[PDB]
Amino acid sequence: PVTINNFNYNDPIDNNNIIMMEPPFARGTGRYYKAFKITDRIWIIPERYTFGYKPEDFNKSSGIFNRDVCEYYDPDYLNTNDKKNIFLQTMIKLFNRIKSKPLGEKLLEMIINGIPYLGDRRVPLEEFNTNIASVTVNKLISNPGEVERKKGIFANLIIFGPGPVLNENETIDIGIQNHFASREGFGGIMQMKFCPEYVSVFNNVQENKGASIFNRRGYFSDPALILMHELIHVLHGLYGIKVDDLPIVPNEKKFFMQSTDAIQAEELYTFGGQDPSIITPSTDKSIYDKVLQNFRGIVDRLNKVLVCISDPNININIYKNKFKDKYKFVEDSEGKYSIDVESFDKLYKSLMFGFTETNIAENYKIKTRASYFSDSLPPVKIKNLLDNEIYTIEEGFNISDKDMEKEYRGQNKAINKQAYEEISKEHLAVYKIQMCKSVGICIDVDNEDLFFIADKNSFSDDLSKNERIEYNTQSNYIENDFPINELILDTDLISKIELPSENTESLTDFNVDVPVYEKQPAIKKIFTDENTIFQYLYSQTFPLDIRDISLTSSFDDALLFSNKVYSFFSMDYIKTANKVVEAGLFAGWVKQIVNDFVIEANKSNTMDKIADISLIVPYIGLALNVGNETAKGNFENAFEIAGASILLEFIPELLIPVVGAFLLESYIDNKNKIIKTIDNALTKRNEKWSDMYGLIVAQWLSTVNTQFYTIKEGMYKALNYQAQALEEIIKYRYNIYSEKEKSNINIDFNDINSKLNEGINQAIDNINNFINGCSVSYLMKKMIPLAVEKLLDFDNTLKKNLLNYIDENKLYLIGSAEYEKSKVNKYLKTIMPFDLSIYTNDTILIEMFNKYNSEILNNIILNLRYKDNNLIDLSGYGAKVEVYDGVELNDKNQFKLTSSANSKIRVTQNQNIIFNSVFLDFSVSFWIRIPKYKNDGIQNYIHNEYTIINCMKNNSGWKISIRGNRIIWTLIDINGKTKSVFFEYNIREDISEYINRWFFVTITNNLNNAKIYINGKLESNTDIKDIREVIANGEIIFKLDGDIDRTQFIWMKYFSIFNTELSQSNIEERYKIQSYSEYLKDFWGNPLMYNKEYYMFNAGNKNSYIKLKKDSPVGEILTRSKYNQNSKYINYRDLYIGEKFIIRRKSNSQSINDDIVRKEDYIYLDFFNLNQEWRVYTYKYFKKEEEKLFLAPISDSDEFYNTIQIKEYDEQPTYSCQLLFKKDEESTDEIGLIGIHRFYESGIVFEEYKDYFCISKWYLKEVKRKPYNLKLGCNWQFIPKDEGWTE
């Protein structure tokens, strides 16, 4: 257990627990400091840390010490005895809180017992030397006013009060002759500058601060955790493992890049959480090896130490026993010490991955920042840590008796205001970047708001080095983790070996290096005429001395005029926001504009499914203009084309090493040492794949995800500025009114802010999900594949290497050289899938990843779409697409393949995607329109099969072909085995749903089956168990290849490939999404058009057509003629028959050219009677349920309705449409729908039933029924002449 001593600052010096100490950096000169022993080996000196600092620097100036800290200055802190005493009691309380739990008690016990080795690198192996500044510190015994008597003592930690900046706590180690004992295995006296009351503040982006943008946001820190973070640094230093290695260094070559000090792995390790993942596995192992090498030197010293010359009183045995336990060395029955790999690994991981800020915060239920790389906010001052009403040893601020325990409410600035006080900005210093244009106008930007983008030099290239494979050789992995619960329950972790007495001989060698610090300018001026994120955010603010503003969509005007504020919301929102109204209409306007704000913010949930994008925040580009000028043009379109990459401010240059070669050493006449060497070489290969992925993850997190974090913070700021500006306008407009008027205005400013704030929160959630999605997208599509390429190349070089190795050892291997020959082929066959959870256990990151992999659209590895008269792959994997001259393309995403040699498309797939999952698993989807057979060429039509899409490599692959009315899917494995599955549609149907009409195809493949779906419905299935490996990433050739007629062609649309098996549910959804349109379609499935001749088809009377009756102004219904030749293979009803109709637009007199017919449009349904254009009318006053339509010349009669409204009552995909007659466009009076009705006729000669073109009210209720009745006589389709259908 740990005992915390009690004392008052004014207690008498006793030269034991209360002394006058001579601090290490005083060099044995100057004055002494009253120090108090809080626990064994730990001292508290309640005075400012002045070593290396100029006296005047304790005052706030135009300079700063640290470029990334909101620095608070106060030279009076600790300037009285009472203040010193409060510091003392507060430190006592914090140590008590720390030991209130086993984990913290153990951190303290480890520190107290982790006594520095007696010496350093300069000391002979056979000696213990206490006469060095990192081991002994002196205390003055003599009377005041004279240093006539001093004594030495051993110490572990000395905690001082703060230096110039109160909130910049720091742990410092002692260097002597350019070296640090605390970094070379020995350990040494550690020092700290600490301030308990002025704590850091942080806000979580992925979350909310009480969800109040009008209230204070963020959470303040628990000083006990802040102290424990430093104590972890102390721990590292005491055990001599606070080593230096390759640091993460920020790129600072661009003006938008954040400048900060190099960051050591020891810092990211100390913080924990996701940060250790920014340290590559390569560097993790480098650090591990350095520490182990340091411990080897110490264990050698314990075997050789014989005396202590500096202190004759030192019992050599007592210390050897203590250092043995400290470093967990093992000792044989003779006293020989050695390193135990298991105990070392456990100790090392406990110290680096067990005791971390993140782990301690979780255990003490204290909230803290999510990462070292997060924006820092202004610190605050805790009112009184010694008041149990606000802070307790047991619960800190989160006191359950005050219900401040749940959701860390006690640390919430918006909730626990009684616990802290804000700091006067006049005492805060912050490093800013002044961005000026070449004119002059400048903008100040806090350094913390810039993008942190690690430079390429931050990452190790150890993966390029060669590796020697021996029978000995084994894998090397360092789990950046440690079971916290076993640490807490460890029975041998905490020492039970005697702590030596602290008194020793006086220190006489005061040699030591004292750091020297100095402030630097708080403002750096740069020049740039760029208008990126910082300028765009700035254009959304206004000066404090201005109160009357107006919004504008002009960024330029916003920068120019102080009373103009930029808004990225709609034109209507902006106009309404600047509207001035009468008092009586103000409450109405307020409700209106606030509602508009919410609607605009809500557009962050926009979907773009037709482009295969589930979520898109359309206004991000207008809001920040971040990345590649995202504010210009249409953002959704630009994102559809380039994806996540367009949002990044900078495209990082990734380090992706050419993996080094393997040197396999032979052992002639040794069957085992050879087989082992091969086994080891194979496992080592996996280490290379894992380490490579780790390198990528480290770079992604420190160069890409950091940028997306900045964008998220940026959108939060943008949305808040928008709300603040609106709030400003509302206040101004309201204060223009008199008191008499205000009294009668019904406004509730708090409900207004509650609604704006809610709208913002909703938007932020959408934005966070969108950006997180973009980040993972970049990692998976723009980073992982580039590493896979190098890794696959490595595999190839290693493959021949191993096979040739087996070759040179064929004798010594005998009958097995072939067995292992294939061992190499199959092992290097299955490639390592990337799994982020292997490199991190951070919940936020893991969930992001899992979410990404749970979205079927992220499985799209090829998506050919039309863009500026060309077809390109928009899957994000960058396939090369060559569209040759004979291919016809249009903006409807349809492309035509003809019989010409140059009507071809060549696609080169990305070779670095997991497609070969070693069991077949992928899908292909597309729409196709196949022309009708030529009546006089039916034999060749049913006989000649021709390929349309072929993808082969090494005579293995897949292919799509057609033979007349059948479409076929074929697979061919590496052996030549073939399997096929097909869909054949009937060519003897009176009316076909497939011939020359657009339909949706989807083929899926898994280990057992190959299935073909048509329009979402399963049609065929073939068992493909016998099929082995099928190479599917070969080149894809779209071209009609076979014995085809010159007139043969095929139309295709939306070709895509998925690297997984789509479910029936996925396919049905894709069918519906890709079928959707605002326009109606024609019989063939193309867009319905105005001013285009069409024959009419009735889905309820398929074989019937309309013809103007010879003796009456009505349309009689006749039976379609049919195919008349003798072929036994075909039958159909003529389609080009009956009156030739034409749809005319009602609105706008923009003449009669052509255009697209949309749902709900008002139209005129006309037709040609010889050289004249007639029209379809409905007699206004019929009283029956239905009546015959009136067909006559164009004219306007008060007795006839002439306006039709084209409709679509079916919710599912269909090419049918309905035609409605309403009294007029405005009324809700429905006259009825156009259809067909049967009438009985009994004349003097003939008796019979006849159908006529009619309108009926009966259809009105029928179209409402579910499921939609496709057979209704009110369902029509328009058939235009088409080269794909001849009769």
Nearest 10 degrees: CA dihedral of 7, 13, 18, 23? 130
Smaller CB distance to Zn ion: residue 236 or 409? 236
Annotated binding site for a ganglioside GT1b (d18:1(4E)): 1021, 1185-1186
Smaller CB distance to Zn ion: residue 169 or 532? 169
Smaller CB distance to Zn ion: residue 199 or 1279? 199
Smaller CB distance to Zn ion: residue 226 or 624? 226
Backbone angles phi and psi of 161, in degrees to 5: -85, 180
CB of 233 to Zn ion, least distance (A): 6
In one letter, which amino acid is 816? S
Smaller CB distance to Zn ion: residue 247 or 1138? 247
Compute the chain's Rg from CA coordinates.
40
CB of 393 to Zn ion, least distance (A): 24
Whole-number Å distance between alpha carbons of 66 and 54: 16
Q: Is 230 an annotated catalytic residue?
A: yes
CB of 1063 to Zn ion, least distance (A): 49
Whole-number Å distance between alpha carbons of 1255 and 1249: 18
Alpha helices per DSSP H over 971-1117: 1064-1075
Smaller CB distance to Zn ion: residue 367 or 1053? 367
Whole-number Å distance between alpha carbons of 642 and 877: 10
SS3 1131: coil
CB of 217 to Zn ion, least distance (A): 25
Q: Are 636 and 616 in contact (CB under 8 A)?
A: yes
Helix and strand totals (H; E) in the chain = 26, 62
Query: x/- contact string, 445-484, with Zn ion (CB under 5 A)?
Result: ----------------------------------------
Q: Are 503 and 151 in contact (CB under 8 A)?
A: yes
Site size for Zn ion, by CB under 5 A? Answer: 2
CB of 224 to Zn ion, least distance (A): 15
Chain breaks in the chain (C to N over 2.5 A) after: 439
* Contacts (CB under 5 A) with Zn ion, residues 246-275: 267, 270
Q: Are 1268 and 1212 in contact (CB under 8 A)?
A: yes
Smaller CB distance to Zn ion: residue 267 or 765? 267
Backbone angles phi and psi of 1018, in degrees to 5: -65, 130
Question: Per the residue annotation, which of 197, 230, 357, 600 is the catalytic one?
Answer: 230
Annotated binding site: 229, 233, 267, 1021, 1185-1186, 1236-1237
Print burial letters for 150-174: b (CB count within 10 Å at least 16), e (below 16).
bbbbbbbbbbbbbbbbbbbbebbbb
Quick one: the chain helix, strand, coil %, rounded to 5?
30, 25, 45
CB of 436 to Zn ion, least distance (A): 35
Task: Of 694, 677, 684, 920, give the one whose Cα is nearest residue 795.
Answer: 684
Whole-number Å distance between alpha carbons of 791 and 690: 10
Smaller CB distance to Zn ion: residue 266 or 873? 266
Whole-number Å distance between alpha carbons of 1093 and 1096: 10
Task: Of 670, 668, 674, give the one whose Cα is nearest residue 471.
Answer: 674
CB of 223 to Zn ion, least distance (A): 15
Whole-number Å distance between alpha carbons of 981 and 1009: 10
* Angle of CA points 375, 381, 383, to nearest 5°: 150
Whole-number Å distance between alpha carbons of 469 and 687: 13
Q: Are 954 and 1031 in contact (CB under 8 A)?
A: yes
CB of 783 to Zn ion, least distance (A): 29
CB of 229 to Zn ion, least distance (A): 6
Print burial letters for 546-579: b (CB count within 10 Å at least 16), e (below 16).
eeebebbbebeebbeeeebbbbbbeeebbebbee
Smaller CB distance to Zn ion: residue 357 or 820? 357
Annotated binding site for Zn(2+): 229, 233, 267
Smaller CB distance to Zn ion: residue 258 or 270? 270
DSSP 650-717: S--------PPPEEEPP-TT-HHHHHHHHHHHHHHHHHHHHHHHHHHHHHIIIIIHHHHHHHHHHHHH
SS3 726: helix
SS3 1239: strand
Smaller CB distance to Zn ion: residue 45 or 172? 172
Q: Which residues contact 634 (CB under 8 A, 6 or more apart)?
A: none
Q: Which residues contact 314 (CB under 8 A, 6 or more apart)?
A: 118, 128, 130, 308, 504
Question: How many C-beta neighbours within 10 Å does residue 271 have?
Answer: 20
Left, alpha or beta for 967 (phi > 0: left; psi -120 to 50: alpha)? beta
Smaller CB distance to Zn ion: residue 268 or 763? 268
CB of 194 to Zn ion, least distance (A): 12
Strands of 977-1092 (E only): list them.
978-984, 999-1005, 1009-1014, 1017-1023, 1035-1041, 1050-1058, 1089-1090
CB of 287 to Zn ion, least distance (A): 16
Whole-number Å distance between alpha carbons of 331 and 337: 4
CB of 262 to Zn ion, least distance (A): 14
Query: What tokens were used for 381?
Result: 């001052």
* Contacts (CB under 5 A) with Zn ion, residues 266-325: 267, 270
Annotated binding site for D-galactose: 1236-1237
Query: What tokens were used for 640?
Result: 């559809």
Residues engaged in binding Zn ion (CB under 5 A): 267, 270
Please give the positions annotated as active site. Answer: 230
